[PDB]
Ligand binder design. Structure first.
Ligand SMILES: Nc1nc2c(ncn2[C@@H]2O[C@H](COP(=O)(O)OP(=O)(O)CP(=O)(O)O)[C@@H](O)[C@H]2O)c(=O)[nH]1
Ligand SMILES: [Mg+2]
Length: 414
């Protein structure tokens, strides 16, 4: 039988709106990531979606068909159990331009990524470019480009687009990134994509001695409405461990923590709690490592975790030393152009007093520029940000025509 383990690797799925990201995740895992009523109603991804699958291989069968996502080799005529390789999970990002920040948040949790490009739309669309560049900046460079929807165009049309994709990636870090043509909807050529995932998105080395840090993207409770008070389960916090590992019964804290109101005055205080449970998908565990999206059960009042209240927080062990900053200095670089805009636009230099959006880990925060130099800016933040390490990358966005657009990136200087 196959072991029940946590996913050991996170693969982002990104790309322009409606290019088929969520359907691709479904093709691979059997799961539809959109769980929220607003997502199902509007027919779009809004929150980061999530799905897991085991990956195995039928050792006595031809590849790529030999790769499977379930413990059966019958499709290649064998009754032998396939060899288990690893469990993997997908971080399914929204494609809508208005949701770029969510993509940025998700990118902090990715070990590698799939850029989905629809074969029946002109390449390169605005969020194809924006998501691509964001991946480059954040360092998610174990990339596979998936040409999706090949079922509705001829082979030669798909090939014309393939040539365009090679041209686009030529001279960039992605020059030799593989391109896999598939139909996510009708499940065509999926095995080849699985093989590509095994080949090009290998599980990275994890130094489990590092101080445990988790980036938070969800928070909620499992309390059915009309639940008795003596039955109210504690709040649950969801996210991905980026370094180290957590264990049941550990004393932890959420940073920056809770917003505190003292007659108009607002500060933040760390939330201290204890891990009462650890879950990945449907399975419970005693410890949680990088890879996968973990649900940490706590003793927190569920009101504190309700409705993703803690999105953007980090979690550490209670005694960790972590700067929680209301002002940050960033060593920055600007892009030449606003890549996510429909019409070509130059990036104006950063100006003092302008309000920028900073993406740091899973957090998204507005701040006012208080100092501008050639290589550095200083920013007064509207809400504080937890800075758990010395070389954290931030992505900088500017509001252009009412839309937040990525314009640059930097290193948060300690
Ligand atoms: N013909 C065809 N249609 C597809 C394929 N993959 C997805 N679609 C269709 O495209 C539409 C959008 O699919 P969806 O998977 O939700 O795309 P998405 O990129 O996740 C949308 P968002 O950017 O908001 O998250 C749906 O109608 C879906 O059935 C494909 O391989 N072939
Ligand atoms: Mg989607």
């Amino acid at each position: 039988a196959w072991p029940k383990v946590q996913p050991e690797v996170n693969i982002g799925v990104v790309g322009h709106v409606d290019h088929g990201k969520t359907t691709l995740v479904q093709a691979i895992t059997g799961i539809w990531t959109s769980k929220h009523s607003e997502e199902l109603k509007r027919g779009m991804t809004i929150k980061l979606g999530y799905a897991e699958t085991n990956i195995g291989v039928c050792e006595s069968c031809k590849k790529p068909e030999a790769y499977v996502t379930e413990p059966s080799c019958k499709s290649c005529g064998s009754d032998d159990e396939p060899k288990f390789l690893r469990r993997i999970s997908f971080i399914d990002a929204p494609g809508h331009e208005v949701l770029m920040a969510t993509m940025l948040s998700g990118a902090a949790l990715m070990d590698g990524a799939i850029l989905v490009v629809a074969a029946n739309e002109p390449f390169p669309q605005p969020q194809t470019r924006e998501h691509f560049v964001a991946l480059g900046i954040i360092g998610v460079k174990n990339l596979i480009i998936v040409q999706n929807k090949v079922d509705v165009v001829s082979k030669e049309e798909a090939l014309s687009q393939y040539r365009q994709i090679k041209q686009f990636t030529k001279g960039t870090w992605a020059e030799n990134v593989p391109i896999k043509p598939v139909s996510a909807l009708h499940k065509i050529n999926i095995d080849s994509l699985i093989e590509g995932i095994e080949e090009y998105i290998k599980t990275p080395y994890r130094d489990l001695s590092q101080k445990p840090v988790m980036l938070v993207i969800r928070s909620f409770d499992v309390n059915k409405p009309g639940t008795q008070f003596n039955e109210l389960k504690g709040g649950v916090i969801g996210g991905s461990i980026i370094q180290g590992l957590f264990k049941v019964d550990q004393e932890i804290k959420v940073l920056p923590g809770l917003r505190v109101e003292k007659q108009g005055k607002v500060s933040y205080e760390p939330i201290f709690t204890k891990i009462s449970s650890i879950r990945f998908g449907d399975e419970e565990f005693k410890e949680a490592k990088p890879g996968g999206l973990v649900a940490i059960g706590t003793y927190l009042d569920p009101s504190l975790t309700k409705a993703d209240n803690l999105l953007g927080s980090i979690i550490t062990l209670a005694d960790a030393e972590v700067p929680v900053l209301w002002n940050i200095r960033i060593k920055y670089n600007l892009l030449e152009r606003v890549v996510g805009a429909k019409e070509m636009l130059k990036v104006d230099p950063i100006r003092a007093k302008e309000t920028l959006m900073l993406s740091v880990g899973s957090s998204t925060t507005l701040g006012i520029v208080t100092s501008v130099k050639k290589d550095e800016i200083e920013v007064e933040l509207r809400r504080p940000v937890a800075v758990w390490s010395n070389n954290i990358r931030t992505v900088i966005s500017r509001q252009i025509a009412g839309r937040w657009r990525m314009i640059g990136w930097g290193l948060v200087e300690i």
